[PDB]
Fold:
Amino acid sequence: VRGRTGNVLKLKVNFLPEIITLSKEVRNLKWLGFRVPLAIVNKAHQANQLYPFAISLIESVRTYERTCEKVEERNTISLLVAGLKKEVQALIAEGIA
Amino acid sequence: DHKTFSEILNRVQKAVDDLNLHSYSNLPIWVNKLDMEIERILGVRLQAGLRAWTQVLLKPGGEPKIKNVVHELRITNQVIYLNPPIEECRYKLYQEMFAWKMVVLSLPRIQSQRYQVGVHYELTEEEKFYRNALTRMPDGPVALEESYSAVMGIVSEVEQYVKVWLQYQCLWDM
Amino acid sequence: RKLVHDKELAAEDEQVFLMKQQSLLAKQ
Structure:
């Protein structure tokens, strides 16, 4: 990161707005009647299936960032929420596994 | 003031009870840190109060007051001895100083053990009151030393004046 | 009466969590 050469672990599902663009393009092609790479269409169908899970993962990443920011703010109470921090770390380790 | 210290301590204790209900992690460690901080604050207050009492003998500082003294005369059998005893005046001054000091140092102890249970009441110095703070004065032993020295000086001056006035027992005894 | 010794409740650091995560990512 800027000011921190350590790897800022932005862990998340392998997703981006490109998947949403592909899903919208598939919907538009279906509406307008066009030919397309039907293998890519099946991949877009799988991405549309997995999209709510990806949204949940992004929300979890945002929540973890918010918790880290809260700890950085209240470093004066950082030991007090140590139980929540440990629970979150264990859950994150399970998810990373 | 004693009431103000009690109110602040009660607010802190209610907050501590709420935090214990909050189910946070490391509650004993947090209680220990809060107790240490309260000890430092009380120590600053106690050093200031001892200095103020010494000056009064001679705003967070405080300002106590003083009582009167046992000064009188008698000829009961012709012994002109001041009433009550000079030891009585010294005891009164020492008691007043102890009461003024205990007004601050006798505030309620930290109720961080309210979350604790399993043994009996442990009302030692720091258990019942803030006992250890008198030794935890941040200025050092110099403040208590100043108070004791002021008590000794006032007593010595009182004894000197009493002796000078009472040198004339021989006039009624000759 | 067994004073204190309440296991010293603590958790791994966020940098420590990231480092263990990096080790797992190497192991991933």
